[PDB]
Each structure stands twice: as C-alpha cells, then as structure tokens.
Amino acid sequence: GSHMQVVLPNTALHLKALLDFEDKDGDKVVAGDEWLFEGPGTYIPRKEVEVVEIIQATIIRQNQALRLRARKECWDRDGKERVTGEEWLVTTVGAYLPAVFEEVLDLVDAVIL
Secondary structure, three states, X not given: OOOOOOOOOOOEEEEEEOOEEOOOXXXXXXXXXXXXXXXXXXXXXXXXXXXXXXXXXXXXXXOEEEEXXXXXXXXXXXXXXXXXXXXXXXXXXXXXXXXXXXXXXXXXXXXXX
C-alpha cells in the first residue's frame, strides 16, 4: 500500500465509497459508490471507501477548465452520493481528471489577466 501521500502534482485518483446508506427520502447507497479525487495527496484508505484507480496530470492548460456532469446517479464528489443531475467543474492547471460516472460537456478557457 502507499498509505497517505502528499499533495500530488495536480493529479487525481478514483475512490470507491463502500458504505450502507439507507435513506427514506428516496436516495440511498449500498456499498457501491465511486468517484475521482483531485489532489488526493492527503487521501487515506478508510473502510468508508477504497482506492480504485489513479490518474496523473498531463492534458489541461494554465486556465482551461473542464465542467463535467454525472452520467448515472451514484458518483459522489465530496462523499455525497448525488444523482445524474449532479455535476462538478475541474479547474486544474495542466492535468487530467477523468471522472467515473461524470462525463465532460465542453471546455472553458479561464481568464489569465
């Protein structure tokens, strides 16, 4: 195992959230959630989730941003199993964060000056 690491060089890894979450509101997970993690340097393997895959940085620019939206309905970004309507935007400077259930919709050049 690599144990907790340090702020990666603008890279991210895919983690799988393993936990029994039963909610009567209409949304519940059963040991089967997974998502990408940018800058997981301080990420540690906790029973709650488990390291699934890893990704280095090498594709974005210094301002280009990538807005991605969920495709299924179980990929949690900050640990909150959201639905396909949930989406997140990546603002890395020279990297590449391929989500798992969230696909990209387009590109957005950020402002440098």
